[PDB]
Symmetry: D2
């Protein structure tokens, strides 16, 4: 009811047991070491909460709905902001010298990784055991986003036929440029965009995570980002990329901390790679 | 054993959404809870550091180079944590006021720990965040025991070199400032008749009045009792000495301490300001200096040309 | 070519230390120069973005969604640049007081030291107070505030004939206040009950004062508010319906205007702080948008859409 | 006075020529692109100013005079703060969409040399190790011939009081304490001990150091490394507080410049190797602290 009965501070604020103190030689900085990681864990729980809620919204199948889409983008943004905070939080442990850590590491143990972070990685998902396993079997954010991308309106060959026209369009462009560098190299690539074999194979090699159709949808959102009906979807893509990056920045920081104290596989990678397939503006079919 | 080690069975089983318990789960309540729990963890950390620093002072031996180094490093740490706590407002900013009021069915904001913190520093009563509800004992100790302000004051008062039959810093300073002011006036008088001059003379009179006012003990006593200053006159002299001789080996680290204190004051103000804003944004219609170390902030006011500063030995 | 494209022959030959010119080189003067040159580059950028936005508004057709996007994105950009200019203050902090005093005199006189571009910026926003012509134009042409006002005044839904947002809102607020009063007076006498009565009294007042055109007229005349009553209704409509798809972007715009006001005011504050430290001797334009939060009502009191 | 004149704004604020505009198709975001890089160049000039002053201070001797040493640390710190700002400045170009960029990408440079002269100069003076701009190149050459920051810091480190084998004999004592302590850990006890033994004892292999040095996997002279390790271990000591601050600054600069160099290319793709490594590696030779030689 009242803070911090409401916040259960009897739990939160009585969960700090210094090993060094327990083993007769209290070390001041160990407290900081505990608090930093407990804070990391709290935010990990919050991120899991937001992420799982988004996952359900997708799973419920009404994601395309503009209200639901807004909720999703909003919560993903929240996850990104939390992640920036966590990246910034390393500055705290930077104020601990490696010596003062040595005065204590010794009551420490090797197996020093977060379960919650593992769960997080799974659900995203990157390439108590019931929770871990459940996180491994249930649908990842990547899969759900892939599904959503696959169902992007405009891909219908008979309808908008985005993929066909684009392809013809690039071609006329390649031809038009050839007659009037060093060029072929972009070419090598633009045309390669239409090589299902290369995409599936690279998919098997793990250099891509999205299905071919999903990639087509993603590229459609990319190209029509300025159109009204695509603003928020593009925001979602941006958010996914950002969360990716930040998760990478965090691992990296995390490791640094351990060497200092001791003696791109990324999952929306396809989204990041969208830029390589950038084309002159007119090569894009009129949208109305 | 990262779990048992971090007692996550406590930390990660302290998230009870009231809205969910009373049948109408509101998603953002979880965020509200987590953010405040994180704040509380860091308040615990800051109180840990601050209490350790206070003890170091109280023991005497603060001046010993090792101990002073400890103190400065931990105060710096507190500063860093505070910067993080300020950035943490960006999280709750991602929460809309209506979704808040979806769950705001429970009882009014304030942390006991934050109150202990303000007391220890310690802020004056007009200005602390509202807190009215074992613990009370704690609180009482926090109001009686010596604050960081008092201890730092004690420390400043004993700044070696303030004694008249030694360096006689204060006497020398009054002399050099008076002389310099006198020289400055001569400097102006030599100029042609404007347009600048008046600019020059006006600033001269303002500076003269401020700088000389520094040597008026009774005025200081007056401002002190009115609460526009917090440090004793002698303590102020010490601070000013550290301020002026900061580059000298024996003053680099003390000056770091001063900078840290000002930083902590600034950040705590910033935090309190962000906090208050949230309540208002969250409450809306229903919502209805100040720096402990204000004197250190005002040190810059008594800045004088380098040559007026008494030479060292 | 880089240097040619960026005209570094100009940019990188514009650093003349007075202290050196007058025989006594002072190392920190260079930093003092560079920081301010960087400031002015960014002010030129901000003026570029801002003027393009003002022009889009002035033309009518702000509402066409592409144009609305141009405006929102560029105003956002201004917000980001201003965040950077605020963080840039950390640089000038690295410079000690004594040392600045080592070179200041070459600077005197201080009232000399103010940016034309920063005032152009303020004019065009606009704060309430050869180059003189540029300044004059900025004084005569329409400010971002007036244009935003015009746009808000034109919000769809305020028509008393149509949706009647304001009419509906008064009715819903009045009714809701009556009901809330009855809910409260029905409680066991208490501690809690007392608090709720007070909160009701203020809430009641703030909410009802919202419909007092004359108070708004009055506050306008004192400058304690800047927007017309009608524009204010518009802003409030955007505010209450912010979650709705068609109001997402307008609200983004409002948020950006608030940020720009905050950040700009912060830069102004910080800046003089330094002049104060170096010498030893609130948020302006869009206050109405800042005050939007005070008028929040319970979700069910908000008129349903059509 | 006047502010406008003092800053030479007549140059700074008339240096913005949009190529897209010059060629009849003005593109709005091109202006942002130009201003961002001009701001980068301004700060680079500041960094070169600070850096050259620090370098000179080292070269003029009397670096050890605490006054000048303070100057060096504060200015190196300043360079660090500037670089943090430059890192945040990428947020500005992040407000430029790949489409809008692509609208003006065609008008320049092309490149290849769309890189800063000043940034290369800075790399040289720091000591970054391994394309035509004519007037300049001699200037660059001069940056290649004059002493790098790395070299001066190396010299400074070699002179660290305590290394002398007369007088404190830091390195020998260190060897004694580590060897004995390693024997004692050997007896008081699986993999980590043999690993720690290998790295810690290899610390005393001058030839391995010269080898790694010739390969460029280390940059400091062996003796310089001894000085650095001494500063590292005795950091709490009065005469080492400021030196350690300097080491920290150098590492920070190395980190930030890396961060910057990385972002200037990650964005080039979005639109289209450590100098003080030894200081970073100091942590690897961390030891229990009983083992650190007692100090005077």
């Amino acid at each position: 009811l009242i803070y911090g009965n409401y916040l259960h501070l009897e739990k939160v604020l009585n969960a700090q047991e210094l090993q060094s103190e327990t083993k007769g030689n209290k070390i001041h900085d160990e407290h900081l070491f505990i608090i930093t990681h407990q804070a990391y864990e709290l935010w990990f729980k919050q991120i899991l909460w937001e992420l799982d809620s988004v996952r359900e919204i997708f799973q419920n199948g009404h994601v395309r709905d503009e209200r639901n889409m807004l909720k999703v983008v909003s919560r993903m943004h929240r996850v990104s902001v939390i992640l920036k905070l966590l990246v910034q939080q390393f500055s705290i442990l930077e104020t601990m010298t490696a010596l003062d850590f040595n005065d204590f590491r010794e009551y420490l143990s090797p197996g020093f990784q977060s379960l919650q972070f593992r769960l997080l990685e799974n659900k995203i998902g990157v390439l108590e055991n019931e929770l871990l396993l459940k996180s491994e079997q249930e649908k990842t954010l990547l899969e759900l986003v892939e599904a959503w991308l696959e169902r992007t309106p405009g891909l219908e060959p008979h309808g908008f036929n985005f993929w066909g026209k684009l392809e013809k369009n690039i071609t006329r462009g390649l031809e038009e440029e050839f007659i009037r560098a060093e060029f072929q190299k972009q070419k090598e690539v633009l045309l390669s965009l239409f090589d299902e074999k290369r995409h599936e194979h690279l998919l098997s090699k793990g250099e891509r995570r999205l299905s071919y159709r999903a990639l087509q949808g993603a590229l459609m959102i990319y190209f029509y980002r300025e159109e009204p009906r695509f603003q928020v979807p593009f925001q979602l893509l941006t958010s996914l990329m950002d969360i990716d990056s930040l998760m990478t920045k965090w691992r990296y920081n995390h490791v640094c901390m351990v060497h200092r104290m001791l003696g791109r596989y990324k999952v929306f990678v396809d989204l990041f790679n969208l830029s390589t397939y950038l084309i002159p503006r007119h090569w894009i079919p009129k949208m109305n």
